[PDB]
Amino acid sequence: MRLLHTMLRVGDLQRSIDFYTKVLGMKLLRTSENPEYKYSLAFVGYGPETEEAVIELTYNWGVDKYELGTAYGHIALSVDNAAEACEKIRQNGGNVTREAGPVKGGTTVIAFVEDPDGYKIELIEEGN
Amino acid sequence: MRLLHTMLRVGDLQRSIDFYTKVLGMKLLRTSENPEYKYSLAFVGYGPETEEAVIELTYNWGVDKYELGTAYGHIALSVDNAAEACEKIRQNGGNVTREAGPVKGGTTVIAFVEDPDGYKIELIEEGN
Ligand SMILES: [Zn+2]
Ligand SMILES: [Zn+2]
C-alpha cells in the first residue's frame, strides 16, 4: 500500500498548473476532462505516479471559489533553495506567509506560502 | 524535490492514530508535542519520511472539531483489496461513501470512505 495523491479543488485549472510547474518545479503528469460531470483534472508531481505521491487538481466548470474550512492544514514539499523559492513565489502569483529561515528551535530552513487558491504550502529545505 | 506530507487537523489524536495504523495498515512514524503553541503531532505513513510522503495529524489541545469546508478533496491510497478494506473501515470508526467497484467506463476498482473526522479517502485497487 502506498500514499498516491492529495486532491485539492481549484478555481482555475491552468493557473494552478502554471503555479505548481513553473513556480514550484513540478511537472504536469497528465490531465483529463469529464464532460458528463463537467470537471477537469490535472496531476502534478516531482516524479512518476507509480513511484511517488503527487497532487491532483480538480476544476469544476464554472466554479472559481470554495470554502477552505478550518480542518485541512497544508502540504509540505522539500525545497532546493527556500529563499529563492520564496522570491519566485512572491513574484509569481503567490504569497509568502513565513519568510525562509531556520525553524523554531532548529536549523532547518523552512517557509510557508500560499498557492493561487490560498492553499497553504510548507517548504522545507532538506539506504544511501 | 518531493512531496513530504499532507497535514490534517483531527479532533482526537489517538482516535486518528488508531484508524490510520490499525485500520489502514500505516505505521506511527513519530510524534511530538509543543507546549508553546499547544498542539501534538503524529506522523503516519507506509514508509519512513525519508522515503515517502506521509500524513501529519495535528491535534490542537482542547480542539475536538473543525469545519471540513468544500475546497479540500481527499487523499488516495492503494489497497490490495478495496472490498475488504471497505468492510474493515466501516466497522472500525470509518464510513463508506462509495462502495468498491469499477470506475465508469473503466476496470480500475475504487471506493471512497471517510475517516473518523470525516476526511474523504479514495481507495484505489492495485481467475476468481
Ligand atoms: Zn507540516
Ligand atoms: Zn483522487
Residues on chain B touching A77 (C-beta within 8 angstroms): 1-4
Which H/E stretch holds residue A99? strand A95-102
- As given in the structure block, the three cell numbers for residue A50 are 507509480
A90: DSSP letter: H
- From the list A53, A66, A117, the residue facing B53 with the nearest CB is A53
Output the CA A12–ligand 1 centroid distance in Å. 25
- Report whether B78 contacts A2 (CB < 8 A): yes
Give the bridge partners for A95, in sequence order: A114
* Strand-pair partners of A76: A122, B5
DSSP annotation string for B74-99: EEEEEES-HHHHHHHHHTTT-EEEEE
Q: Kindly state the cell numbers that stand for A63.
A: 466554479
The experimental technique behind this entry is X-ray
Distance CA B79, CA A83 (A): 39
How far apart CA B109 and CA B52 sit, in angstroms, is: 24
Query: Is A53 exposed, middle or buried, given 0-12, 13-18 or 19+ CB atoms closer than 10 A?
Result: buried
Task: Name residue, grid cell 495529524.
Answer: B57
Q: Quote the CA–CA distance of B17 and B42 in Å, as a whole number.
A: 7
Amino acid (1-letter code) at residue B112 = F
Max CA separation in chain B (angstroms): 57
Pairing of strands A109-114, A120-124: antiparallel
Are A100 and A109 in contact by the 8 Å Cβ rule? The answer is yes
For residues B39-68, one letter each, b for 16 or more C-beta atoms within 10 angstroms of the residue's C-beta and e for the rest, the string is bbebbbbbeeeeebbbbbbbbeeeeeebeb
B56 known member of a binding site: yes
First to last CA, chain B: 41
Distance to chain A for B127, nearest Cα, Å: 22
CB atoms within 10 A of CB A42: 21
Cα dihedral sign, B100-A48-A31-B47: positive
Helices (H), B1-124: 13-18, 82-90
Question: What are the angstrom distances between the C-alpha of B49 and each of A47, A74, B7?
Answer: 16, 16, 13
DSSP alpha helix (H) spans, chain B: 13-18, 82-90
- DSSP SS3 for B103: coil
What radius of gyration do chain B's Cα atoms show? 15
**Pairing between β-strand B54-60 and β-strand B3-9 as defined by DSSP bridges:** parallel
Domains with residue ranges and CATH for chain A: 1-128 (3.10.180.10)
**Resolution (Å units):** 1.8
Report the alpha-carbon distance of residue A106 to residue A93 in Å, rounded: 29
Q: What is the DSSP letter of A116?
A: T
Q: What is the dihedral of CA A47, A53, A59, A63, to 10 degrees?
A: -140
With the C-alpha atoms ordered B37, B46, B49, A69, is the resulting torsion angle positive or negative?
negative
Q: Are A58 and A8 a contacting pair, CB within 8 Å?
A: yes
For residue A57, the chain B residue with the least C-alpha distance is: B73
Question: DSSP string covering A4-65, please?
Answer: EEEEEE-S-HHHHHHIIIIIT--EEEEEEEETTTTEEEEEEESS-TTTS-EEEEEEETT---
Give dist(CA B115, CA B69) in Å, integer.
Answer: 15
B122 is catalytic: yes
Please give the full DSSP string across A67-83, using - where no structure is assigned. Answer: ---SSEEEEEEE-S-HH
Q: Which of A67, A76, A77 sits opposite B71 (nearest CB)?
A: A67
3-state helix, strand, coil in chain B (%, to 5): 15, 45, 40
Q: Specify the amino acid at residue B43.
A: F
Asked if residue A61 lies in contact with residue A40, where contact means CB atoms within 8 angstroms, the answer is: yes
In chain B, what residues touch A67 (CB-CB under 8 Å)? 67, 69-71
